[model samples]
Target: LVPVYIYSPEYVSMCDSLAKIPKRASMVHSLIEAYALHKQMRIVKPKVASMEEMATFHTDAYLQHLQKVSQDSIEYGLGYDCPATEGIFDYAAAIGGATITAAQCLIDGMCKVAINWSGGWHHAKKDEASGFCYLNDAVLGILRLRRKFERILYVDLDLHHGDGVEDAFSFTSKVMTVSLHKFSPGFFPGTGDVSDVGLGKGRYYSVNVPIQDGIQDEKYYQICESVLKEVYQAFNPKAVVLQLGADTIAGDPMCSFNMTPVGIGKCLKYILQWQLATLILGGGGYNLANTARCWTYLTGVILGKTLSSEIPDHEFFTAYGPDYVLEITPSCRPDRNEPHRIQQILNYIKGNLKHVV
Candidate 1:
């Protein structure tokens, strides 16, 4: 079984404007090597996606609009959280292409596990961009995966709801979308509710685990584990896409979940043990150093290696200072997920899973 890490200097460059940090992709790749985790996987360079390839999930007019938008950019959802920056079309292409490349590698059996840290922009819609995601790369990749796999499962762990991805497949039972995020009043791109199973033939295929603010690792993992276990048994997906967004970690600038990489890794460890054709992706992580640490630790987790808690000297070594450790100390924020509420959520989801058959 091969593990492929899709990367390139151009892929990093094209993704520079995708976030607040200029070179967020570069920071992630650098830390993986700083810990020598890069040596454990095969590196694959992604080609830029063509117009027709992107048209798989995006409308032609919408794709054209992305290239040249008018002053009425808000109509395209390209302002505020998602700005139509210069060369925005090219940036979207690079991101979409990288994820598609990862998907192709998995489909061809070249690799069972494919990691694209530059992918997982789940909030972008088929016609509009949202939540800093100019293109829905995960949707595109899953579309590509569906060519070979009978059932494709998309699991989102981002701090924000994966509204776009869920909506994209809302009427299709072939693709099951599951998202666990900090869903509360007035959250960005808010749509995931426990009641939102699916629509039409897609009923009971979509699962949303709405969580509260400041959720700790143990509770977070417990919910994640239980929900995934039931979903796995019900859906029996042939392929899976796991979005490991670092913003859910403690000390994130997003100030949502109170978790460390260990909790996330525990989830990954559980999934890796299944040994399915898995595509691992990166999503919302604000703190640059912690994002790097989280991804590096996850890479180690996938490779069955335990990384040192001590921070390794790297190009971005100074960023991890004032503790300079690889581990992120969870904030003292109390876990807001009540015991009874959690049990109710678990029971509700378990009941919904019965209908998947």
Candidate 2:
């Protein structure tokens, strides 16, 4: 069975802070509980990643500085997005550990698929933290596999381009980084143009597919399938890391996109079909409910568990709310009736993504 590792305790507090936005936290909690009760897959606890392991991707100076300022930043009333806390180090370590564990599970063949919901801290750089991320767990996970494999494919589906992960391996051909994100002329982190493929041996190895607003499941699935099929056939990498960020969904408050749960699931399904050694990691998802629902479907898909497109069982809903509500219909199905605009976007991507793999 596929293994799913979540930061439940961390999620409890994380959700609490987002109480002003309860739907965000409640949704994630509800989905996880539903998955657990259904017995779709095995759940695992993650060990905190060690400093030595973290140093594999992050620089020592930056690590030490972050540890030092972690408390001070909180004490001085730093922002709530990432407030300082007594056990901040532990939280960060746990996040890192989840990614490391997923990578190890892939290497050991303990599970054909593994997911770490706490991971996908992609914006963290080698020297500093940015974009609400403290450590570059995804990068470290790839580094952990370097000893056993030569080529690694890092696929980022976050609405925001994976700037940190792309930067980490921008000059190295050993890793191929592909990102599908929303990019404007002036945006946060301000990078990720199609032209920023890579330098030297890494040139053409880095692929960026910056999409516009109003993208739905059909477009997402077609673009992902085309790019993935081409990249896998060309690179034939030994392992792949898929970053599942829920921010691309339609109702997400932070980003503008129309990706449904089923759209994200299709991407996951494609990866599973390819049967590449894979690790799934979570990225950005502001809407609590959608994030949780998205991951739940992902867990179900990976384990071959079929779920009806209705409210989950009472027991599952009770964990999050006494009067919990489920979708009247399943939103996780492929859009067989494709829209014309979506087809146009898919066709454009297919035609343009020729030089890069």
Of the candidates shown, which would achieve the greatest TM-score relative to the real structure?
1
Q: Model 1: residues >4 Å from true position, as ranges?
A: 69-71
> How many steric clashes does model 1 contain?
0
How much is the lDDT of residue 77 in candidate 1? 79
Q: Which runs of model 2 end up more than 4 angstroms from their true locations?
A: 4-30, 71-82, 313-357
TM-score of each: 0.97, 0.83
**Candidate whose lDDT is highest:** 1
Displacement of residue 4 (Cα, Å) in model 2 is 4.7
Per-residue error for 29 in candidate 2, Å, reads 5.0
Global lDDT for candidate 1?
0.88
Per residue, candidate 1 scores C-alpha lDDT tens digits across 1-46 of 7599998888888786765667788889988988887778989999
How does model 1 score by TM-score?
0.97
lDDT for position 296 in model 2? 71
